[PDB]
Write a protein that binds this ligand. Structure first.
Ligand SMILES: [K+]
Ligand SMILES: [K+]
Ligand SMILES: [K+]
Ligand SMILES: [Mg+2]
Ligand SMILES: [Mg+2]
Ligand SMILES: [Mg+2]
Ligand SMILES: [Mg+2]
Ligand SMILES: [Mg+2]
Ligand SMILES: [Mg+2]
Ligand SMILES: [Mg+2]
Ligand SMILES: [Mg+2]
Ligand SMILES: [Mg+2]
Ligand SMILES: [Mg+2]
Ligand SMILES: [Mg+2]
Ligand SMILES: [Mg+2]
Ligand SMILES: [Mg+2]
Ligand SMILES: [Mg+2]
Ligand SMILES: [Mg+2]
Ligand SMILES: [Mg+2]
Ligand SMILES: [Mg+2]
Ligand SMILES: [Mg+2]
Ligand SMILES: [Mg+2]
Ligand SMILES: [Mg+2]
Ligand SMILES: [Mg+2]
Ligand SMILES: [Mg+2]
Ligand SMILES: [Mg+2]
Ligand SMILES: [Mg+2]
Ligand SMILES: [Mg+2]
Ligand SMILES: [Mg+2]
Ligand SMILES: [Mg+2]
Ligand SMILES: [Mg+2]
Ligand SMILES: [Mg+2]
Ligand SMILES: [Mg+2]
Ligand SMILES: [Mg+2]
Ligand SMILES: [Mg+2]
Ligand SMILES: [Mg+2]
Ligand SMILES: [Mg+2]
Ligand SMILES: [Mg+2]
Ligand SMILES: [Mg+2]
Ligand SMILES: [Mg+2]
Ligand SMILES: [Mg+2]
Ligand SMILES: [Mg+2]
Ligand SMILES: [Mg+2]
Ligand SMILES: [Mg+2]
Ligand SMILES: [Mg+2]
Ligand SMILES: [Mg+2]
Ligand SMILES: [Mg+2]
Ligand SMILES: [Mg+2]
Ligand SMILES: [Mg+2]
Ligand SMILES: [Mg+2]
Ligand SMILES: [Mg+2]
Ligand SMILES: [Mg+2]
Ligand SMILES: [Mg+2]
Ligand SMILES: [Mg+2]
Ligand SMILES: [Mg+2]
Ligand SMILES: [Mg+2]
Ligand SMILES: [Mg+2]
Ligand SMILES: [Mg+2]
Ligand SMILES: [Mg+2]
Ligand SMILES: [Mg+2]
Ligand SMILES: [Zn+2]
Lengths: 44, 89, 44, 120
RNA sequence: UAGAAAUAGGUGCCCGUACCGCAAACCGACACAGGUAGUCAAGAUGAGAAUUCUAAGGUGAGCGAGCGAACUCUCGUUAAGGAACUCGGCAAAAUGACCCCGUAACUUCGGGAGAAGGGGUGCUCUUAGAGCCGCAGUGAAUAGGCCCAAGCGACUGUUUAUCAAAAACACAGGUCUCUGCUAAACCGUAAGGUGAUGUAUAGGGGCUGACGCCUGCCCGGU
RNA sequence: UGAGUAGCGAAAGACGGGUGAGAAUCCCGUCCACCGAUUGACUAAGGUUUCCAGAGGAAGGCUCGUCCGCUCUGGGUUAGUCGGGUCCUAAGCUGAGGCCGACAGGCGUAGGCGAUGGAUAACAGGUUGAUAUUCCUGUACCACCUAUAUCG
RNA sequence: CUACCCUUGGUCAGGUUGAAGUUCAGGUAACACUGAAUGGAGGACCGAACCGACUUACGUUGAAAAGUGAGCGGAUGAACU
RNA sequence: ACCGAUAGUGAACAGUACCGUGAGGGAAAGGUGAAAAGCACCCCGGAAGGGGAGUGAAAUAGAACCUGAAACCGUGUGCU
């Protein structure tokens, strides 16, 4: 129910290895800057 | 003492709307009754008073930085004139 | 559920007010203690 | 079919509201899942309107809301009348596919995927 | 009893008055599923302020979007069986409204009793019949499960606010005892009080605990 | 640290339009839905400015926020008749003298204070952003004063 | 807050049962006594409000330092406020 | 041959704020610069906040303002 020992800096960052976001899937707008793929401009 | 009874006229949108109906609003001394206010108005402005309505205002919570406090308590009299008129301006 | 403090202006003044404190020697002792300590509020 | 995070009665009512709003405004912005669900409702309604008979009109009245539409100049009509009038005539020669969905991207408040669904 | 008009005009003070108020403003440390006295009381249904849907009027609840895994919680259904479960039928299921029949032992003759157990109910028409429809007619919601037997306590009531509601307390009834009134008993140093503006068919204290039938022997010891 | 983890406090929302640097969350509209012996309306206690308008968005709001019971500035409560005092008493409190007590004090007579009760003259309509049986209009009533002709 | 008490106020949808009395018709020497009607008693019955807190489920760094849901006891009284 | 901001008064700026029905309990919080000379003006931004330009001996003295340790949180990488 509770941590028996505190988590070291090393273990914490090891666990955060995969905690990240990825670059959006984006494409240049041929006529109308960049946009999400399969989305309309909605602002151009 | 009539000039001690009346402190100052009250000039607001509501008091101007009352002035349109010959009603004049004053801040008065907090220890006076409406008969004293009527007599003071009659003595100072040489008018006839139809009636006086009076009300008390509690101190208002107020601050300036860490210094919180209260405004002074007020007594407000609305004086309805029978005849005459009062030129405050 | 009903709690212990049910405020009542009259009750509060009659039990803890200035005149009730002045009414007994021990109440006057309370007032003297509070004046000695320098309290802003001596009673209700 | 999708549940849309609602009970059956709530989901049915929301789908009726969305379908009527689409019929009235012809173009609405909603979430992706709601639009994917309502495309079927709206297109089956348009099918009934193309059928045109009295029984089809009453079956359509089971689904449509009772809303009024002020037209060009102070002339009113119901959403059912528009569905069996202008909308049905617009799609006489089109065999299905009366709507399209255009994705807009996430919105600020909850990251939900905003889309436009419009009549074709 | 001693004792010693109308009309017209005018005058009439102080305090409260905002706003919340069955709550986001009060009491709960919170914009807290709790607590907070009174008043007003629509329609359909109904005995009703029950039930369900509505009126007046108010409100959509200060995180959302998806998905529709395990598991947890709340809810619905279930073949055949029907308490085999379990400490225990715990929980659930069943009963349930109205109208009409019918109803045991026992009993303090009140009761038990809504005992139990049965029947009916929709819609249309004619003046109780004749019809019509469904699986189903108090077609939803709400509305006693019942019976046999034993222990305890007579009974309504009271109790460990917050693990015990009971066989515990109380009780009406019984008995013993004290008390002749400045009563005894009780509070208080006293004054002064309660008892009681009562007076032995009254008041205090102990024990027992409706009612029925009863309540034996021992006074050496305390 | 646990960890971007638990939670974000009973519920029905959808769309259009607007505003804005920014909108699921603010405003407006339509539809839908919930309470309705009450989630409606009005009194009391309690709170004490939270009320209204304009401006704002650091902090507070369990998210957001252009919004707010939050911040800034300016305003708002009107009574002869409503409730209370200038009337009455209950419980209780107090108490001239008085009785009692090491002190301090306790008790108590006349008397007084004290509503939760008794008495007691105003109603309908209109009006504001914010007050209304209080302001305005209409029509009244009560107490006292004066002027023109038994009280106890 | 809570316990008891004092003074002064307030509240209890509906349904059921049917005590004593009274009247009439008998019955009697008189009185008992019988039947119907009426009557409306009760710490009476069923059941909302209201007051409780028996069981169970949930909750147990709670929505809540004692609650919520579903049933449950009382509900003209030693009632509740 | 007393303290020097956890010390010294509880209190250097308070019997206040806050807590409690009440008696009562009771904090935290000192330092720009010599002098306000407290950053004209330009740029991004709704603002907040910044980068310049100025003031100053110093602005990593810019008001959360002397010095600014450690825990803790980041960015780069020599070896692994
Ligand atoms: K007012
Ligand atoms: K003996
Ligand atoms: K003896
Ligand atoms: Mg006034
Ligand atoms: Mg789905
Ligand atoms: Mg449904
Ligand atoms: Mg008001
Ligand atoms: Mg509020
Ligand atoms: Mg909320
Ligand atoms: Mg609340
Ligand atoms: Mg509450
Ligand atoms: Mg009724
Ligand atoms: Mg109801
Ligand atoms: Mg089965
Ligand atoms: Mg079967
Ligand atoms: Mg069977
Ligand atoms: Mg078995
Ligand atoms: Mg077994
Ligand atoms: Mg059970
Ligand atoms: Mg029924
Ligand atoms: Mg039938
Ligand atoms: Mg018993
Ligand atoms: Mg009982
Ligand atoms: Mg207990
Ligand atoms: Mg135990
Ligand atoms: Mg218990
Ligand atoms: Mg006596
Ligand atoms: Mg006994
Ligand atoms: Mg016994
Ligand atoms: Mg014996
Ligand atoms: Mg002897
Ligand atoms: Mg952590
Ligand atoms: Mg995650
Ligand atoms: Mg974990
Ligand atoms: Mg997880
Ligand atoms: Mg979660
Ligand atoms: Mg919430
Ligand atoms: Mg409803
Ligand atoms: Mg406001
Ligand atoms: Mg925020
Ligand atoms: Mg404000
Ligand atoms: Mg005395
Ligand atoms: Mg003496
Ligand atoms: Mg009163
Ligand atoms: Mg108002
Ligand atoms: Mg009532
Ligand atoms: Mg009873
Ligand atoms: Mg209550
Ligand atoms: Mg109890
Ligand atoms: Mg319950
Ligand atoms: Mg019972
Ligand atoms: Mg009952
Ligand atoms: Mg230092
Ligand atoms: Mg110090
Ligand atoms: Mg600078
Ligand atoms: Mg700069
Ligand atoms: Mg610069
Ligand atoms: Mg600088
Ligand atoms: Mg430096
Ligand atoms: Mg420094
Ligand atoms: Zn583009």
């Amino acid at each position: 129910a509770v941590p028996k020992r505190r988590t070291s800096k090393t273990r914490k960052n090891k666990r955060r290895t995969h905690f990240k976001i990825s670059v959006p899937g984006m494409t240049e707008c041929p006529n109308c800057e960049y946009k999400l793929s399969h989305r309309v401009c909605k602002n151009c | 003492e009539a000039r001690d009874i009346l402190k100052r006229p009250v000039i607001t949108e509501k008091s101007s709307e009352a002035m349109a109906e010959d009603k004049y609003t004053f801040d008065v001394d907090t220890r006076v009754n409406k008969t004293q206010v009527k007599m003071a108005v009659e003595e100072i402005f040489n008018v006839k008073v139809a009636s006086v309505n009076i009300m008390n205002y509690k101190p208002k919570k107020k601050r300036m930085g860490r210094y919180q406090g209260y405004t002074n308590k007020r007594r407000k009299a609305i004086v309805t004139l029978k005849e005459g008129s009062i030129d405050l301006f | 559920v009903k709690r212990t403090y049910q405020p009542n202006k009259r009750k509060h003044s009659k039990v803890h007010g200035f005149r009730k404190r002045m009414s007994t020697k021990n109440g006057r002792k309370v007032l003297a203690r509070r004046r000695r300590k320098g309290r802003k509020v001596l009673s209700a | 079919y999708r549940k849309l995070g609602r009970t059956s009665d709530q989901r049915k009512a929301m789908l009726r509201d969305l379908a009527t709003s689409l019929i009235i405004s012809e173009r609405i912005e909603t979430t992706e899942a709601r639009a994917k669900e309502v495309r079927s409702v709206v297109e089956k309604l348009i099918t009934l309107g193309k059928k045109g008979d009295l029984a089809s009109r009453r079956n359509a009245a089971k689904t449509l809301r009772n809303v009024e539409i002020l037209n060009e100049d102070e002339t009113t009509q119901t959403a059912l009348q528009k569905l069996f009038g202008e909308i049905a005539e617009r799609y006489t020669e089109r065999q299905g596919g009366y709507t399209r969905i255009l994705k807009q991207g996430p919105r600020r408040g909850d990251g939900a995927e905003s889309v436009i669904i419009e009549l074709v």
